Amino acid sequence: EQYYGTGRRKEAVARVFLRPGNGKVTVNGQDFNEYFQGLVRAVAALEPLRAVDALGRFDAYITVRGGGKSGQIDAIKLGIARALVQYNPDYRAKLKPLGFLTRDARVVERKKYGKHKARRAPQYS
Amino acid sequence: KGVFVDDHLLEKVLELNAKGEKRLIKTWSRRSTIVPEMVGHTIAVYNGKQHVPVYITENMVGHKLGEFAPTRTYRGHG
Amino acid sequence: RIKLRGFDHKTLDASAQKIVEAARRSGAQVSGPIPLPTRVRRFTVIRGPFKHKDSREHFELRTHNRLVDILNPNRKTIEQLMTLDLPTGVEIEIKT
C-alpha cells in the first residue's frame, strides 16, 4: 500500500509514506504547497522523486516534527530517498551516486565556556 | 490604597501638633512619607552623618522624608 | 505503575528487571522496563577560588526516571515484592 522512509537532518523528524499514484503531497494534514509556502528550499525532498523519474508514480503522506522549516525539508530528503530504495532496492543506483541517501551530521555546536557563541571569541586588548 | 509613614514619628507628630505645636523632632526615618499633618514644623532628618532639619510647607506634601536632606556633598569638580 | 527513580542507572537497571523478573514468576504479567527522559540539573562553576571567569567546568545531576506496570495484580505479588532486593541507591514507587 505504502512505501516508507525515515528522515532526519539536524534535530528534525520526517516520516514519509510513498503511497503510489498521481503525485499530490500532504505533510501534517495539508498540501506540501500550503505548509511550505514562501520557501524556495521547499522544492525539495520531492527532488529524490526527480532522481528516479517518479513524480508520477507516487502521491505522498508525511508526518514531521522538529527543527524548523527548511531543516524539516532535508529530513524528507532522507525520507524520500529511502522510501524509493525500499520500493526498488535497485534504485539506490542513481540515488547514492546522486547523493540523496546518507544523513548529514551537520549539527549546531555546543556553546563553549569563554567563547560568546561556541567560537565568537571575546574582544581583547 | 497604600501610603507608608513609619508610625513612630506620626505618633509623636499627632502627639506634638496635638499637645501644643512645637517642632525639632529628631528621627532616623527618611523612608516615611511626609503626611499632611507634618505641615509647618521642623523635622531633623538623618542623611547618614548629619541631622539636616526641614521646615515643612504645603509646597511639598505627598513627598518623602529623605529627598529633603541629601546624603552626598558635591560643591564641584575642579 | 511501579515508578522507579534513582541516580545510578546500572544499579537502577538491575532492580527494574528484578521487580520485572520476579512479579512475572509471582502473578502476571509485568510491563517491561520503560525509561523516562532523564531530568538533568547542571552546575557550571568558576574553577578557581577568585577571579578567572575565563576558566570554569561542567558538572551534571542525572536523575533517570523508570516506570513499570503490573497487569494482573494478585496476592503473593505484593508479598514477593513486599520484601525486595535493594540497592543502597534506588527509589521506589507503588500504585495501580
Place this chain on the structure above:
Amino acid sequence: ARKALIEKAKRTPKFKVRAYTRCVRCGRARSVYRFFGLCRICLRELAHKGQLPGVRKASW
C-alpha cells in the same frame, strides 16, 4: 566582620527579605547553590572527592 556574621544568617531577624544564603563548611556569602547548600568552591572540591551523591563531571 565574619564569624559573628555567619551566626547572623542562622538567626532570622526582623524581616523575611533580610534572610540570605550564607554557607556551611564555607562561611561564604556569594555563589551559594541552595540545592547543594554549597558555595561554588565548597561545591567543586567535594564534587571531585565524590562526597556529592551522583554528581558527575559532564562532557558532551
Place this chain on the structure above:
Amino acid sequence: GKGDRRTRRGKIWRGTYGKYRPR
C-alpha cells in the same frame, strides 16, 4: 526596534506584555 518599548519588538526582547504586545 528592540529598545522601543512602545511596540511589538520592544516588549519581546524585554520579556513583557501590555498593549503593544498583550496576552
Place this chain on the structure above:
Amino acid sequence: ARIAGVEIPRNKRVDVALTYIYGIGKARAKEALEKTGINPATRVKDLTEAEVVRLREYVENTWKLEGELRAEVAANIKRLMDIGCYRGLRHRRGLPVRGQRTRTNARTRKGPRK
C-alpha cells in the same frame, strides 16, 4: 496656524500629522479619530474644513498641548527645584533625575563632554 495649538502637517495622513503636535503621540491621536470620525487614512489636504474644524473642535477642547504643557511640565520643575527635593536639586545641577550613574555616559543631560 492650521489646527490645534497652531501647527501644520499636510502631505502626510491625518493621524501621523496629529502626532507632530505637542501633547498628542500615536495613542491620543487614534483616540481623536475615534471621537470625531475622520479615518486615519486621509492625507490632510484631503480632509475638507468640516472634518478639520471638527478635528480642532474636539482636540483644541480636550487636552493641553501647545504653548502650555511646556509651561505645565516646567511648573513640575519650577516647584520641584524650588521645593526640597533632591530631584529638583539635580535640576539645579543639570543632572540625571531618575537615578543613573554619572561617573560614565550620562551625556544627554550634560551634552557632549568637556
Place this chain on the structure above:
Amino acid sequence: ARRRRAEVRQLQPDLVYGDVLVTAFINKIMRDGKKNLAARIFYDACKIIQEKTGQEPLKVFKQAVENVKPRMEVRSRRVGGANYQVPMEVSPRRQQSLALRWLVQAANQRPERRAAVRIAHELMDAAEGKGGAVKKKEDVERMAEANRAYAHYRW
C-alpha cells in the same frame, strides 16, 4: 591552509534554474542568513529583467557575470623598500567571487527604491557595457597593464 590547498566547496544548483552560479549570487545577496528573503530578490528582479527589456532572466545574469569578471588584477607586494602593485591574471575562481561581489555592491548603492529593482537594473546594464561593477572591472584591469613594469615581479 599553510598545509593544505583549502577545499573548494561546490554549491547546490538552484531549484528554479538548476544553476550553481545562481546560488552563488543569491548567497552574496544574502544578509544575516535570511536566504528566503535573498531568493525572492532574484526572481523579484529576474521578473524585472523580463518585464523591462523582454528577454531571458537566465541569460542576462550569466552575461552580467562575464561582463564584470576581471582577467588582470594588481595586488601590492614589498620589494627593496617599495610598495609595487603587481600585475597578475586573476584566476577563474577568484573571478566568480569577484564578479558576483561587485555586482551586489554596485547594485545596493543604486538610487532605486526596492532592492531587487536595483539588482535587475545592474545585471541588465552589465551585459550592456555600462554598470557600476563594470567601471570597477576596468578600473582594476587598466590599473594593471599601467603596471606591466612589474610583470616579472609576479610569482
Place this chain on the structure above:
RNA sequence: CCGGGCACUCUAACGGGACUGCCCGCGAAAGCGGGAGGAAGGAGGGGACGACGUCUGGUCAGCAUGGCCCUUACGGCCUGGGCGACACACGUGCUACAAUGCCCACUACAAAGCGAUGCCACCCGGCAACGGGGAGCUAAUCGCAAAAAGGUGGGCCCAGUUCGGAUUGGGGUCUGCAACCCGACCCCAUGAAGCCGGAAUCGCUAGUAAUCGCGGAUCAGCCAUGCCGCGGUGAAUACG
C-alpha cells in the same frame, strides 16, 4: 478522542560499526594520492583530558595556614548612609542611524530546561502592569509556553522620519517592613544623539561567522544588555 495496536516517532540503557581493513597508484619500510562498498571514512563533528615547568603569575577576601599586630576595640549589635558620588579617561557590551527597514493584523515550524506557602490552565475586571476568582501537576501524561525570524497582505515612501528610544513630566501596578537616596514592570506625553564613524583595533574556516528567539542558575523583587546553555534561518573565502 475511545477501543485497538509497538510498526513508527520519541524515550533511555546495552550493543553493532571504520580497521588505510579492500583495490588502484608510489614508496625500503611507515606512509600519501585516488577508487568501491559504506550512515559516516582516513582524529566524522565537538567535549572532557592539558607534560617537566615558566611567569617571586593570582586568591590570607571562599577556606584553611607560619608570623606580625588589635583584645570596653582593628571585637560585636544596631539605626542611617556609602558600595549607585561626576568636571573626565579607557575596556566589554546593548540598541541604533533604516526600505534586504519599521509598523499592524493573521498564519506556521524548535530545542533545553525549570516548575508546592511553585508552574499558575480558564474565565471575569482593567488600554495595561496587574488584580480577582479558579482547574490541573510530586510531573515525557497538568504548567511555564509566546518561540522569534520566517509566510500571507495591508500600512509607511526616503522624511532625522510609522527610522532611532534617549530624556523628562504625570498617572499606575507588583515585590518588600521599607523603593528619598537607589527597584523592575505599565499607560499617556515628552520623542535627544545618531544619516554608519579619525588614528587605531577584535572575532571567526561550515553549520563556523552573521542574524533570530528560548531556558537556567543566583534571585522575595530587581537595576541580565552579564554569564552558562538550547535550538531556528544559514554564508564569505583560503594563490600562498
